[PDB]
Design an enzyme around this catalytic site. Structure first.
Site, mmCIF file in Angstrom:
data_model
loop_
_atom_site.group_PDB
_atom_site.id
_atom_site.type_symbol
_atom_site.label_atom_id
_atom_site.label_comp_id
_atom_site.label_asym_id
_atom_site.label_seq_id
_atom_site.Cartn_x
_atom_site.Cartn_y
_atom_site.Cartn_z
ATOM 1 N N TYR A 30 18.041 31.574 118.039
ATOM 2 C CA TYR A 30 19.348 32.161 117.767
ATOM 3 C C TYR A 30 19.835 33.057 118.901
ATOM 4 O O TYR A 30 20.690 33.912 118.684
ATOM 5 C CB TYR A 30 19.329 32.958 116.460
ATOM 6 C CG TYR A 30 18.594 32.266 115.345
ATOM 7 C CD1 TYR A 30 18.811 30.923 115.077
ATOM 8 C CD2 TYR A 30 17.697 32.963 114.544
ATOM 9 C CE1 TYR A 30 18.144 30.277 114.038
ATOM 10 C CE2 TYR A 30 17.026 32.331 113.497
ATOM 11 C CZ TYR A 30 17.258 30.993 113.249
ATOM 12 O OH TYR A 30 16.589 30.373 112.219
ATOM 13 N N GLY A 31 19.292 32.902 120.102
ATOM 14 C CA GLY A 31 19.677 33.791 121.186
ATOM 15 C C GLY A 31 19.125 33.286 122.500
ATOM 16 O O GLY A 31 18.487 32.233 122.569
ATOM 17 N N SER A 32 19.408 34.036 123.557
ATOM 18 C CA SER A 32 18.815 33.776 124.858
ATOM 19 C C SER A 32 18.098 35.026 125.344
ATOM 20 O O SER A 32 18.384 36.133 124.889
ATOM 21 C CB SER A 32 19.871 33.352 125.864
ATOM 22 O OG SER A 32 20.781 34.407 126.071
ATOM 23 N N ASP A 163 8.703 33.475 116.699
ATOM 24 C CA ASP A 163 9.637 32.669 115.919
ATOM 25 C C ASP A 163 9.047 32.222 114.583
ATOM 26 O O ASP A 163 9.355 31.132 114.100
ATOM 27 C CB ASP A 163 10.136 31.478 116.734
ATOM 28 C CG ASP A 163 11.085 31.901 117.837
ATOM 29 O OD1 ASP A 163 11.514 31.042 118.633
ATOM 30 O OD2 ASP A 163 11.410 33.107 117.914
#
Ligand SMILES: Nc1nccc(-c2c(-c3ccc(F)cc3)ncn2C2CCNCC2)n1
Ligand SMILES: NS(=O)(=O)c1ccc(N2C(=O)CCC2=O)nc1
Ligand SMILES: NS(=O)(=O)c1ccc(N2C(=O)CCC2=O)nc1
Ligand SMILES: N[C@]1(CO)[C@H]2C[C@@H]3C[C@@H](C[C@H]1C3)C2
Ligand SMILES: [Ca+2]
Ligand SMILES: [Ca+2]
Ligand SMILES: [Ca+2]
Ligand SMILES: [Ca+2]
Ligand SMILES: [Cl-]
Length: 343
Positions: A30-32, A163
């Site tokens: 959901y991101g970098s 994760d």
């Protein structure tokens, strides 16, 4: 704190002056993610900017979920939080969330790719995965998609699971997850560990199936045809009829599959790569296995504090998830830099 802006991964990051020399190191859930230098402690860190965290109730609740999970994790083999920040000065402006953890240079694919690993090194890697799994499982958190790309590793082969609790490779997924079988327990993750360990020992993917059906066939060729009792777990009649229709396959002798491996590694693999999850060894049982004798230390394999997941069952409006998330940002207390003592 004064913030500055920098374009990273084609978008504007706004971060405190505390964090310097940001450089991209890939996407995350959901991101970098950017590597950075923490000028307060001189430590290297990884900063994840969540992508549109309050776009919809799906993004909003998963933002809250990830922040709650990461604030709870306090284990040397599990990603946890050093910091969380937002440029927002109030809830009314709150739109971006950044999560900070210790920098880990690689994932497990970068350890095994160009290196014939020793058995002692494989032991250490798998031991660490199991130690982190015992911890997250003790808080009723399951990973459900454990794979090498979700195992962060640093320059000294120290490993953290990431994760957890949240087109992707299916080669490491538990069959009951991949095929949506009606029952599954925490040992889904142990199947994944077996898949990873096998690859560390042979240099080859264990079940490189092209689709769900092909992967199931490769799995049944190793572990053998299942009994009728496992069909109890499969909802779809078409899937049950299909499995029942395949020619009977015996379980292979794992000693003839992992040729020249430590007999203790083969024995552990036999205990983990079991089709029925209720017969699989748990992470806590696996840590006592003789394969890990040189690393096992009961005093240093802790469990987690109780984790309140009651929010998971609740549907809230997007602004309530946003406010709850802002509450969790503002209430975060950074850990001490040194949280360990000599044994
Ligand atoms: N280099 C590095 N070091 C630590 C973690 C990560 C990280 C995070 C992450 C999670 C939480 C957080 F607060 C900060 C970062 N999410 C994905 N990755 C991956 C980025 C590239 N693949 C391997 C790790 N990356
Ligand atoms: N599938 S394989 O025949 O290519 C193969 C490759 C490597 C291995 N192996 C070793 O050499 C040491 C431990 C181990 O498991 N076994 C099988
Ligand atoms: N984890 S275990 O060692 O208790 C275990 C349990 C069961 C099994 N198994 C089956 O279920 C069918 C064939 C087979 O070998 N294997 C290992
Ligand atoms: N990967 C292998 C051998 O290369 C394939 C053949 C057989 C069953 C599975 C696991 C092993 C052994 C698929
Ligand atoms: Ca477990
Ligand atoms: Ca010790
Ligand atoms: Ca210390
Ligand atoms: Ca001790
Ligand atoms: Cl809690």
């Amino acid at each position: 704190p004064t913030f500055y802006r920098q374009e990273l991964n084609k978008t504007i990051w706004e971060v405190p002056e505390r964090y310097q020399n940001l450089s991209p190191v890939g996407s995350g859930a959901y991101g970098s993610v950017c590597a950075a230098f923490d000028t307060k402690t001189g430590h290297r860190v990884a900063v994840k900017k969540l992508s549109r965290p309050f776009q919809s109730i799906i993004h909003a609740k998963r933002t809250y979920r990830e922040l709650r999970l990461l604030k709870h994790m306090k284990h040397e083999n599990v990603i946890g939080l050093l910091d969380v920040f937002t440029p927002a000065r109030s809830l009314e402006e709150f739109n971006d969330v950044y999560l900070v953890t210790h920098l880990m240079g690689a994932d497990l694919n970068n350890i095994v790719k160009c290196q014939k690993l020793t058995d002692d090194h494989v032991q250490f890697l798998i031991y660490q995965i199991l130690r982190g799994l015992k911890y997250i499982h003790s808080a009723d958190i399951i990973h459900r998609d454990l794979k090498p790309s979700n195992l962060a590793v640093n320059e000294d082969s120290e490993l953290k699971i990431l994760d957890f609790g949240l087109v992707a490779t299916r080669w490491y997924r538990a069959p009951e997850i991949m095929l949506n079988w009606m029952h599954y327990n925490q040992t889904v993750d142990i199947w994944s560990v077996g898949c990873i360990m096998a690859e560390l020992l042979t240099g080859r993917t264990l079940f490189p199936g092209t689709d769900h059906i092909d992967q199931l066939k490769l799995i049944l060729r190793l572990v053998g045809t299942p009994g009728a009792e496992l069909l109890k777990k499969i909802s779809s009649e078409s899937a049950r009829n299909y499995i029942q229709s395949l020619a009977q396959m015996p379980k292979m002798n794992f000693a003839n599959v992992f040729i020249g491996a430590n007999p203790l590694a083969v024995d552990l693999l036999e205990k983990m790569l079991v089709l029925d999850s209720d017969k699989r060894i748990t992470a806590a049982q696996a840590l006592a296995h003789a394969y890990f004798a040189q690393y096992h230390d009961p005093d240093d394999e802790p469990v987690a504090d109780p984790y309140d997941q009651s929010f998971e069952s609740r549907d809230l409006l997007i602004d309530e998830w946003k406010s709850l998330t802002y509450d969790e940002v503002i209430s975060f207390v950074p850990p001490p830099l040194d949280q360990e003592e000599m044994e």
